[PDB]
Structure formats: structure tokens, C-alpha cells
Design a binder for this molecule. Structure first.
Ligand SMILES: C=C(C)CCOP(=O)(O)OP(=O)(O)O
Ligand SMILES: C=C(C)CCOP(=O)(O)OP(=O)(O)O
Ligand SMILES: CC(C)=CCSP(=O)(O)OP(=O)(O)O
Ligand SMILES: CC(C)=CCSP(=O)(O)OP(=O)(O)O
Ligand SMILES: [Mg+2]
Ligand SMILES: [Mg+2]
Lengths: 240, 233
């Protein structure tokens, strides 16, 4: 039995985006066009990311969720997967002495135990920082987030900790790994115009911004153009 | 315990459609806002006839979201009343028509027009038109979860059986998912439409207001889609 008409206003959104989501596309192409190995360009993810957080933090942006590794690029090249997972360990060097709090969402339990330790250390070292919250989606996906939230709700219902009539938008928010407040703005570099199983639940009323700029070329100027674009946009949330 | 590493998804088989821009179309032409909404169903029928000729098999169209209840009483009543016209426009066409959404919130009269429209068209072999009325992506994922929870409490599945396939079969919009999404009206957002189903869908946004969306705008969108597929495939 369903009822949705007189139900409440329950939306985790909104001149400055509080939360920006980011899909970092274009790295392999950027190596080719300049000439370097495709190893490179992937080298620029972490420095660019630190740079983006610096600019963003200065502007008043409070959260950034960055899409590093989906559940689908486990089937990219055998050599390229082993490279990227080991390179992300250098998160520790770049962020551990910053004002940046750092969390990782995804199925951590399937990664190299080395990487599991680096993530736990990076999370604990930065947990007290008062600055901008940087969430890194690693071995994450939209289907994944919704399914694990569902198993967790099913398990509670089987142990009498809730019933079917408790299952609503707030309950589901509390079980998902990416929580309120949801992204006001999604930025995808690299020219593709889709979400590719990143967030799904969370994007319900996000403003989308797509650019052809490859990610290593995405500098302060490009980021300000994205934020000005967003500020020109009229958000109605289904109303008038 | 999680473990990670689709019998869904050049001519798109399933198109998803967000029919936005009706009030601004009216107001620009000096017309009352309700003149805009009177073009929704006729335009949608016209788009079904064009799509059927192109080989498209499914269209899922956003007619009323769970958030549109926030407009004025006058605007809501006109729309729920106007959607009874679905019976007139489609009962004697070649389109097969289904409605997704929480029907029990609607006026009992509209519930009857809907049930009659589904009944009279159920045998049509042509294009399948799915109309999302009082629908939302939040709603659809929540109702799929409650259904999964009740199966568990009746001993029909374990938590370790919960996966992408089981979840798809509980949702109101099922596989195959939309290949292409077309949103008229100029805005770049999905507005709580088919959240789970759009994971790999191509997003096509256009400034053309819905009452102006014609055959050539539709052919341009499909041509964009075919270009994207050569690029990222
Ligand atoms: C599987 C393919 C085609 C390459 C993956 O590239 P991304 O990680 O950028 O994701 P999509 O291009 O598929 O959206
Ligand atoms: C029935 C439809 C097409 C809902 C989306 O249109 P809206 O006008 O409600 O979307 P927003 O601009 O408010 O996000
Ligand atoms: C998804 C990740 C890790 C990076 C996105 S950039 P890429 O490596 O997929 O490079 P291209 O899109 O092929 O140019
Ligand atoms: C189809 C419905 C009910 C809404 C989408 S069109 P609209 O009423 O939102 O018109 P505007 O976006 O206000 O121009
Ligand atoms: Mg890519
Ligand atoms: Mg609108």
C-alpha cells in the first residue's frame, strides 16, 4: 500500500553549491594527445584533486565526492588496474597534513590489504580536520550503494528492529554510504553525457554540468565557469 | 559482506522522455497556463506514432511526479482531471499503454480511466507506451524494498540472495532500461525520474519546449545518440 500526495518535503539540497560531485574523465586521451604513456595523465589525478579542493574550500564549498573507480572498471586492462590501485596510496602524502577530512565509500573489503591499511590510516589521520570533506568513491557504484542499504534494511526487519511501514526516504538516506546533503552540482569532464552508475539515489535533483575538457586540463578557470553556470540556473524541485 | 567484481539496455530500443516546458510555452504565447498542458497528451500520441515508424519499441514518459503535488490546488486539479483524456486519445489507437506510479492517491475516476485504458490496449502489438503518473525514483526504489522485505519475512529469500537481478524484477520500470533520455524545456537534471534505470542511459537535453517538440527534433536526438555510440563503444 502506497501514499505520496500529502507526504512531506524531504529534500537534501541547496549562490554557492554546498556539495559538488565530480566524475574525472579523460586521462588516457590526455596522455595520447600530448604524447606520454597512458601511465601518465593518471599521475595527475591526485595533484589536480588536491588543487580542486583548495580552490573549492576557498569558495565556501563544503563537500566534494569524486568518482575514482567504479565497480565496472575492474574489467579494464590487467596492467592498468594494478597500477591505479597502488597509485591511490599516495593520497596519504597529499592530504594527511592538510585541513581536509577524507573518507572513502565503497566495498573496501575486496581491495589489497595494503590499500585497506592506507585508506584506514588516511581516514583516521584526517578525521579531525575542520575543513572541506573529500569523499573518494573507490570500488563504488550506484547499484551497490542501494543494494547494501537494502540488505541492511532487510536484516533489521528480520530482527524486529523495524517494520515495512517504517521504510521511507529518511530511513534509506541513513543506510546509504553517500548521505545528505546530496550534490547540488555534478561536473563530468571528458565529453561523455551520462552518469555511468556513479551516484543514482543522490542525484534526483542535482544540476548537471558537462564539459569536453579532459580532466588534467581542468584548472581553476574551468571550475569557476562551472560554478557560474550553476548560479545562472533556476531550481524548482517540482514546484512553482 | 560485499562482493563486486545486465539483461537490460544504432536505433534506441527504449526512450525515456521528460515532457517539460509547458507553462513557459503558454506564457510566451500570451496564453493561459492551462493551454500549455492541453498539448501534453496529443503531442505524446504524435511522438508515439513517429517513434513506431522508426522502430522504437518502448517509450517511458514523465507526466506527473511525486513532487508536483506542491503546485496550486487549481493547477493539480486541472491536471488530474485532464489526464482522463488518456482514455480518449489511446483506447482506440495501436499503442499498448501502461501506467506506473501510486495509483491509489489519484481520484477514483482517474483510476478507472487508467484501468480501462490498460485493459482495452493490452493486446496491441505495436509500441509500448509507459506513462509515469504520480511516479518518482525514490518511490519506486522504496516500494521495491518493501516488497523484498515482505518476501524475506515470508521465508522466500535470504539477504544473501539480494542482487541486481532480484531488484530489477521488483521495480515498476523493468529491463530493458532506457538507452536514451530526452528532456525538453532547457533544464539539465532528472527531477527524481527513473533513478535506478538511468545508470547507463545517454542524457540528451534540449531547449525546445515540449509543445514545440516535433519529428525533426526527435531525429536530431537520435542522431546525437548514434554519434555518442561511435565515440564511446
Ligand atoms: C568501459 C568503457 C567504455 C571505458 C570506461 O571509461 P569510464 O571509466 O570513463 O566510464 P564510461 O566512459 O563507460 O562512462
Ligand atoms: C512531470 C514532469 C515532467 C516532472 C519534471 O518536470 P518539473 O518542472 O517538475 O521539474 P523541475 O524543473 O522542478 O526539476
Ligand atoms: C575512471 C577513471 C579512473 C578515469 C576516467 S579517465 P580514463 O582513464 O577512462 O581515460 P579516457 O576516458 O579513455 O580518455
Ligand atoms: C508535465 C508536467 C506536469 C510538468 C512538466 S512541464 P511544466 O508544467 O513544469 O512547465 P514549465 O517547466 O513551468 O515551463
Ligand atoms: Mg573514461
Ligand atoms: Mg517544469
Amino acid at each position: 500500500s502506497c501514499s505520496l500526495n500529502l507526504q512531506t518535503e524531504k529534500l537534501c539540497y541547496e549562490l554557492m553549491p554546498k556539495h559538488i560531485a565530480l566524475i574525472m574523465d579523460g586521462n588516457r586521451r590526455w596522455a595520447k594527445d600530448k604524447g606520454l604513456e597512458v601511465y601518465e595523465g593518471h599521475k595527475h589525478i591526485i595533484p589536480k584533486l588536491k588543487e580542486i579542493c583548495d580552490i573549492s574550500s576557498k569558495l565556501g564549498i563544503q563537500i566534494i565526492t569524486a568518482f575514482a573507480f567504479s565497480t565496472e572498471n575492474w574489467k579494464r586492462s590487467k596492467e592498468e588496474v594494478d597500477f591505479l590501485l597502488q597509485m591511490f596510496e599516495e593520497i596519504y602524502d597529499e592530504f594527511s597534513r592538510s585541513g581536509v577530512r577524507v573518507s572513502i565509500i565503497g566495498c573496501k573489503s575486496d581491495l589489497p590489504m595494503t590499500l585497506q591499511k592506507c585508506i584506514a590510516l588516511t581516514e583516521e589521520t584526517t578525521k579531525g580536520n575542520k575543513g572541506l570533506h573529500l569523499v573518494i568513491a573507490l570500488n563504488y557504484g550506484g547499484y551497490y550503494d542501494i543494494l547494501q542499504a537494502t540488505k541492511s534494511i532487510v536484516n533489521k526487519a528480520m530482527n524486529g528492529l523495524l517494520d515495512v511501514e517504517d521504510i521511507n526516504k529518511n530511513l534509506f538516506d541513513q543506510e546509504l554510504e553517500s548521505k545528505c546533503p546530496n550534490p547540488d552540482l555534478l561536473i563530468r569532464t571528458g565529453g561523455e553525457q551520462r552518469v555511468s552508475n556513479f551516484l543514482l539515489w543522490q542525484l534526483a535533483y542535482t544540476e548537471f554540468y558537462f564539459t569536453n575538457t579532459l580532466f588534467p586540463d581542468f584548472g581553476e578557470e574551468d571550475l569557476k565557469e562551472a560554478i557560474m553556470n550553476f548560479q545562472q540556473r533556476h531550481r524548482r524541485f517540482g514546484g512553482h
